[PDB]
């Protein structure tokens, strides 16, 4: 072992190499893996689709502001379009994997910032309106990321989610988010964050187009600074991997 | 920019909008009109087929104070250059970051259904294309210019061979020179 | 031949065989399998249509020269040299230092010129190509003392059989061949620069042996080149401006490569 | 002296006999490969794993 | 072995000492040796001089500004001038050396640039205009830079060497000038190049003022730069030190 | 290998080999001797001259083609392909996928013109047939530089000798060869269809060597083909249409079988 | 390598040597004759025999 800060991963197809990290946080203290005959209810049988569907799907860019306040996304959703695994996604019925989440931010010696990169299993969210209940349209985007804000919600539009940053839109303590793993991301020492996680559910499998498993949110705890004569954009863009896939019950498209 | 060394080194920037490309061009060795010209293009015309992989290597040259990550995709044909960044990530890839060792090699494999293909450019036995795009912005501390130029390698891997023999089209004689 | 392939499963390590330095001068040795999981395939190519053995072991022209049958001076000659043609010129610049042994042919030829006898009946014609090498005697006509050949190796064919086919040891002075040579002749660092200034390799001289006719006959001989046991040090890379003299290096300048419209452009 | 030897198979023998004095009147030597890429590839005084990270 | 990037080399008399370089490259794979008694022909005996020739000289420097071209040398007559070594090359008929090519050139974080250090063995050129040959006084320097031009070399003056850069002078293609040993000097990673030559040529022994044996480039693929309020001056140096040198044939000076 | 027979006696069982279904696809199996009482006589006939290798293993005329000697432009080419002739091609259609080796051979003739002037008498005359694969330099006329044949294989031969043969590899891309083809080229599933989308095989040049003369003389080539080692898979019922098109199957139907007056006269 | 083999006899020996070095330069292999009629004739999935029914 020599130079800690140098990775290297090639899942597949393609292959994401870092100069300058930190470490790589792996889920609870678990590897993904398939799912044993031991507990399983399917009784038709399973398909291990191919090296063609865990493979590094590159979602969206954003611009890290000086006044952002923070994005997220919806993990087996926003993979819903991407290759093959948007395929074996819709024409089946069931299915279970695991991710390894990436993030690439990379600014000069001259640079100030830090961000929040966590996955929360089981997101839920709070509308605006009290009554109803969040629409969809402003709950998941189509791999496009989804912002909050700094005034609160206001009182629109009755379906719209409240996005107040410091509540985090779930309802808890911002500083208590470091419970579920994570990584920081500060541009004094840090270029990017790894983040491997294994299904965690209650059933065995589950639906992906009823239920969405994890979240991935990224809250800048520092924002961006810079004296005169610099780039005054700075990008950030996600990079995932579906982990050992499977699925059952084929039937038609929808 | 063909009589300097200007076309030599991809002209990198940092701008707003993200997703932009930086390069592309199909992959075809000594027929496109980009890598027949090289090392590897001025040998591969002495003969008329070839099978292997090839191994493409980048190396960032901007200031020690610069960052920034890129893509690097191959899609095999069946509908090639992809317009978007989301249309070539499904197809193979991998993801660079500049600094300290910055040189990455993306190793084009080799996927072909016959055995062999053509020098020539036969839309037949078709090879590919090649792009890369911009993963995140390039982010410069002040008093830095923005403005950084990469160079792109190319060589051979170790499953490579070639094969019939022929005569390169590249040299012609009119008289004999006294 | 070459290799085979290695299956690969997914990994999460910190082994990183894709970043590396390119300033040390040192090519990679990476190969597929190790950026990306693959399946196991057995090669059973070979590289052996490649080698310098098989890849220069072919004949190719180098110069051809005409002699009528006319006048006391028909004879034709011819210094030895190389870079004549362009063809296997550069299939030699690609290496600096060479070795290897030759196989000789001549493909003569033949053809009538307009004369004003009634009648014409030519049997057939007699070679007689002679090879002189550097410092020693000279012909000047048809009928010389020269041709006797006491000495100098010379080679005699009828028309209408197969060609003549010979063999040439490494005859030189130095130890290898010199496709490049840097610096001039005299001490005095002046004159003459070039490559010639080390290749001298003899003469070659042609004739008819028939007396004569009412013709009268026109040849032309082909030579042919075919390097057998060859060896090749320190490569370099190869042409890209045309050949326009013979014994220097002179060039005009030109683009590296053909034009596209556009930087993004397929 | 003749030797039996092998032949060129896509995957047998054939005999073969010398009739002169000199050495210049064999055939090429077709049938020999022998291939050492570290000379040009890779001249570098200190080995280089692909493992370990290239400068430091 | 610890901290790679530093090096140290003393030879002789001298020492030249960097903290920040990359690898050494070894020539063709060889050490330069003497020459043994089983393929020399010379009937006298040879004459290893010293470490007095086996020394560390320096020769000129030159400014990279941002617009230049590139510079070249010529090995054994570069040195034709320096200490004992240009006593015991004009004194004796014969010899024959290898060498230890070293450059440095250093910059700050804050400026950018590229260059490509390669030596070429047997350089030859060819004159501007197609008929003569190349003059003298236009193809070696005593001991000073020759540099190339933007433009291609006009038709002057019927000796004049063509300074066409893209095309190297030589004519081939300058991309394809990385089969000779080599290095490059990135001013982000590097800060100097080291090259060690063995003695390569077809004779064993060969003159030293009627043929010259290697051809020292340097070419800059990508320009200076740096932003205003910087110093505007980066001077290149090249240290060469002859190796394992030996002579024959003893007569007058010249 | 043929096989014996076997000596049968009255029976009166319920074997019944005759009776049987044709639905299933199945060919029967009945010999003589179960269907009626027959001696024994043990065959001594082979099975030889109906095997592949012996059946195709004949040389046939593929194409010839003539060039005259007149002009700059006296030389002739043609394209590789094995449809042109009818004897040679039907004895291929009665498979799908061959694999063989084969013998060239090149029976080149000659022929007089008019001309005025008083005495002709012409020497031999030569060749020189080259051959170029595709993708490769190409020659415009009968003083061009493609001539000098550097790495293309050429053959020459002065005309009252024997002719000149030689043998070939299996040069294919595929594991065999294909004399069917059902699809497309381009992947839009669009243009051509037919079998030449596979069918390239070089071209084949041929030339006078002489300078010229005073007939002036014309010739015309002759190719033979001879498929030595074959192998045969997939066979196929024999065509029934003419050929009408040298890269189509287009035909015009006809009936199945000449015409008897009545079903049972004889 | 000469071997010394068969001949056509309507119902004695007569050798044989190779002079090249590829493969394509031998003859035709014509004193080869193999058989086996069960791929075209018969290609159903259980076996008939002739003294049983066809169909039951
Ligand atoms: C009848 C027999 C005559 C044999 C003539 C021998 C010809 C010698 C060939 C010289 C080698 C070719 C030149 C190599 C290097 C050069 O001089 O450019
Ligand atoms: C002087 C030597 C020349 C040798 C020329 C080789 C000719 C190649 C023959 C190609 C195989 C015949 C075509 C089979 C299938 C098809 O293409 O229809
Ligand atoms: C001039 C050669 C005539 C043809 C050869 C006939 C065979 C004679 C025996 C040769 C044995 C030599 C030893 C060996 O096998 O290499
Ligand atoms: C070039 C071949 C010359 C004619 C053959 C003469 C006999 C030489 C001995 C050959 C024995 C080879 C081994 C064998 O019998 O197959």
Do not use: K, N
């Given at each position: 072992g020599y130079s800690d800060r140098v990775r290297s991963i090639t899942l597949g197809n393609s292959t994401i190499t870092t100069q300058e990290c930190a470490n790589v946080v792996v889920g609870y203290g678990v590897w993904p893996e398939y799912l044993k005959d031991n507990e399983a209810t399917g009784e038709d049988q399973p398909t291990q689709p191919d090296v063609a569907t865990c493979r590094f799907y590159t979602l969206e860019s954003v611009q890290w502001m000086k006044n952002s306040a923070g994005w997220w996304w919806k993990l087996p959703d926003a993979l819903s379009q991407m290759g093959l695994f948007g395929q074996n996604m819709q024409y089946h019925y069931l299915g279970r994997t695991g991710y390894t989440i990436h993030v690439q931010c990379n600014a000069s010696k001259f640079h100030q910032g830090c961000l929040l990169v966590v996955c929360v299993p089981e997101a839920e969210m709070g509308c605006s309106n009290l009554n109803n209940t969040p629409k969809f349209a402003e709950l998941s985007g189509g791999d496009n990321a989804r912002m909050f804000t700094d005034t609160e919600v206001g009182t629109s539009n009755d379906k719209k989610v409240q996005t107040a940053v410091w509540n985090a839109g779930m309802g808890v303590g911002v500083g208590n988010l470091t419970i579920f793993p994570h990584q920081w991301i500060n541009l004094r020492t840090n270029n990017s964050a790894t983040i491997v996680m294994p299904y965690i559910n209650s059933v065995p499998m589950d639906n992906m187009y009823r239920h969405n498993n994890l979240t991935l949110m990224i809250i800048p705890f520092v924002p961006l600074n810079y004296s005169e004569g610099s780039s005054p954009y700075v990008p950030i863009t996600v990079t995932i991997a579906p982990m050992c896939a499977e699925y059952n019950g084929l039937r038609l498209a929808s | 920019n063909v009589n300097g060394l200007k076309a030599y080194q991809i002209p990198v920037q940092s701008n707003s909008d993200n997703r932009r490309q930086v390069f592309g061009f199909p992959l075809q060795p000594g027929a496109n009109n980009v890598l027949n010209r090289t090392l590897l293009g001025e040998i591969l015309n002495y003969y008329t087929h070839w099978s292997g992989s090839i191994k493409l290597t980048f190396m960032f040259?901007?200031?020690?104070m610069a960052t920034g990550k890129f893509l690097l995709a191959y899609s095999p044909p069946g509908a090639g250059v992809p317009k978007n960044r989301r249309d070539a990530m499904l197809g193979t890839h991998v993801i660079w970051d500049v600094g300290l060792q910055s040189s990455c090699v993306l190793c084009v494999p080799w996927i072909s259904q016959t055995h062999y293909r053509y020098v020539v450019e036969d839309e037949y036995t078709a090879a590919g294309y090649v792009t890369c795009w911009y993963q995140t912005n390039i982010i410069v501390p002040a008093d830095v210019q923005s403005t950084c130029d990469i160079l792109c390698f190319v060589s051979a891997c170790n499953d490579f061979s070639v094969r019939m023999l022929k005569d390169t089209p590249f040299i012609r004689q009119d008289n004999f020179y006294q | 031949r070459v290799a085979d392939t290695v299956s690969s499963k997914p990994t999460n390590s910190e082994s990183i065989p894709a970043l590396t330095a390119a300033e040390t001068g040192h090519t990679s040795q990476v190969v597929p399998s190790d950026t990306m999981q693959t399946r196991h395939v057995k090669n059973y190519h070979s590289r052996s249509e490649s080698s310098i053995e098989n890849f220069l072991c072919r004949s190719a022209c180098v110069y051809y020269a005409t002699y009528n049958n006319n006048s006391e001076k028909g004879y034709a000659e011819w210094v030895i040299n190389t870079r004549q043609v362009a063809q296997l010129l550069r299939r030699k610049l690609e290496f600096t230092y060479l070795r290897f042994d030759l196989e000789l042919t001549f493909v003569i030829t033949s053809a009538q010129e307009p004369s004003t006898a009634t009648s014409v009946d030519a049997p057939v014609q007699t070679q007689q190509i002679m090879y002189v090498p550097p410092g020693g005697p000279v012909p000047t006509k048809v009928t010389d003392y020269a041709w006797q050949t006491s000495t100098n190796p010379s080679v005699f064919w009828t028309e209408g059989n197969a060609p003549p086919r010979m063999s040439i040891p490494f005859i030189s002075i130095g130890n290898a061949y010199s496709c490049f040579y840097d610096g001039w002749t005299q001490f005095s660092r002046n004159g003459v620069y070039g490559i010639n200034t080390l290749n001298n390799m003899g003469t070659l001289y042609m004739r008819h042996v028939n007396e004569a006719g009412q013709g009268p006959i026109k040849s032309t001989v082909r030579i042919y080149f075919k390097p057998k046991h060859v060896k090749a040090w320190v490569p370099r890379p190869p042409r890209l401006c045309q050949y326009e003299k013979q014994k220097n290096v002179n060039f005009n300048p030109t683009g590296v490569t053909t034009t596209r419209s556009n930087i993004t452009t397929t | 002296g003749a030797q039996v030897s092998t032949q060129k198979t896509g995957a047998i023998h054939y005999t073969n006999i010398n009739y002169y004095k000199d050495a210049a009147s064999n055939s090429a030597n077709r049938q020999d490969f022998t291939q050492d890429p570290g000379k040009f590839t890779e001249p570098v005084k200190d080995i280089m794993i692909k493992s370990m990270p290239a400068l430091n």
């Open positions: - | 040259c901007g200031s020690a | - | -």
